[PDB]
From Swiss-Prot:
Modifications the protein undergoes after translation, according to the UniProt entry: Mainly phosphorylated on serine.
Domain PH residues, every copy: 207-305
Record-given protein name: Guanine nucleotide exchange factor DBS
Localization annotation: Cytoplasm; Cell membrane
Family: Belongs to the MCF2 family.
Entry remark concerning the domains of this protein: The CRAL-TRIO domain mediates interaction with various inositol phospholipids, such as phosphatidylinositol 3-phosphate (PI3P), phosphatidylinositol 4-phosphate (PI4P) and phosphatidylinositol 5-phosphate (PI5P). The DH domain is involved in interaction with CCPG1.
Function (record text): Guanine nucleotide exchange factor that catalyzes guanine nucleotide exchange on RHOA and CDC42, and thereby contributes to the regulation of RHOA and CDC42 signaling pathways. Seems to lack activity with RAC1. Becomes activated and highly tumorigenic by truncation of the N-terminus.
DH domain mapped to chain residues: 9-189
Length: 317
């Protein structure tokens, strides 16, 4: 049978989502009780440096914030769908604003890792672990939030699989796409936070739309010896960085204005070019694939279109 069989599979996924969810909450909690709360416990003070004590947030990030969310809102809302799993895509959608917390958590994560790398042996932790009777150490839990977002993606991807014809299939997709969005976001953010030497706050130049590596030549008015640069496509600019032999050193910017693009060059479908003025300034960028190139050129069109019409009806002021 069809319907009877699919529905039973959908219910199977809903169980995992809900089983793992509960576990997720429980996990974050034992760490906030088992470790975080303990950094503030007088009785434990003799095992914790006067400084590490402060690093409590650097180490945990907004885990608590995340915990309350999933404990007070999300789980409760996910469970409502126990009888109608096809429509669980509504929750994820309606809370994408709340999910922004994950971006904050990941952003801090690298620093946490630096700190953890520098004091993981510390007696304090060893103790908390005994008391908890944990086979594993704090670091494997600090990783839980990061993963949870992907589990969602996989689960949502699975739900839709057995719901293409159900009411809500629309939301499922949207939700799925959105999660993928958060993931792309988080991933791009990680690269941007590894940019060094950018005199100023690389936030006043719009949101990061794309980042990735390319080979760059400059036909301005070196044989075929390109530089390997990591590009960051923002709303107001395109940053060029060198990947340190992951980290990147800022090289130069390209004000996203008066820009002239060349959607196609002869030589390879992976070349497109960014240039300024009448072309006495030109950048030939080679993407790692003609596909990538497509996207970048495309995302760039959008920006100029946007950058452009960011005056068209904005000049009467």
């Amino acid at each position: 049978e069809e319907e009877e069989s699919l529905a039973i599979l959908r219910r199977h996924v809903m169980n995992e989502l809900l089983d793992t969810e509960r576990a997720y909450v429980e996990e974050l909690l034992c760490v906030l009780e088992g470790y975080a709360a303990e950094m503030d416990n007088p009785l434990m003070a003799h095992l914790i440096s006067t400084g590490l004590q402060n690093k409590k947030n650097i180490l945990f990030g907004n885990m608590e914030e995340i915990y309350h969310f999933h404990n007070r809102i999300f789980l409760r809302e996910l469970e409502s769908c126990i009888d109608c799993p096809e429509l669980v895509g509504r929750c994820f959608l309606e809370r994408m604003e709340e999910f922004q917390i994950y971006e904050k958590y990941c952003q801090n994560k690298p620093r946490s890792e630096s700190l953890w790398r520098q004091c993981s042996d510390c007696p304090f932790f060893q103790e908390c672990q005994k008391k908890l009777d944990h086979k594993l150490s704090l670091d494997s839990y600090l990783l839980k939030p990061v993963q949870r977002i992907t589990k969602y993606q996989l689960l949502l991807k699975e739900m839709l699989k057995y719901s293409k014809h159900c009411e809500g299939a629309e939301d499922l997709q949207e939700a799925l796409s959105s999660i993928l969005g958060i993931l792309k976001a988080v991933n791009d953010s990680m690269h941007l936070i590894a940019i060094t030497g950018y005199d100023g706050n690389l936030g006043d130049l719009g949101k990061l739309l794309m980042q990735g590596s390319f080979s760059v030549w400059t036909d301005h008015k070196a044989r075929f010896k390109p530089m390997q640069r990591h590009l960051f496509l923002h709303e107001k600019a395109v940053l060029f960085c060198k990947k340190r032999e992951p980290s990147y050193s800022y090289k130069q910017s390209l004000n996203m204005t008066a820009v002239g693009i060349t959607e196609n060059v002869k030589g390879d479908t992976k070349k497109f070019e960014i240039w300024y003025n009448a072309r006495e300034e030109v950048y030939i960028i080679q993407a790692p694939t003609p596909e990538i190139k497509a996207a970048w050129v495309n995302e760039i069109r959008k920006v100029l279109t946007s950058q452009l019409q960011a005056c068209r009806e904005a000049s009467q002021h």
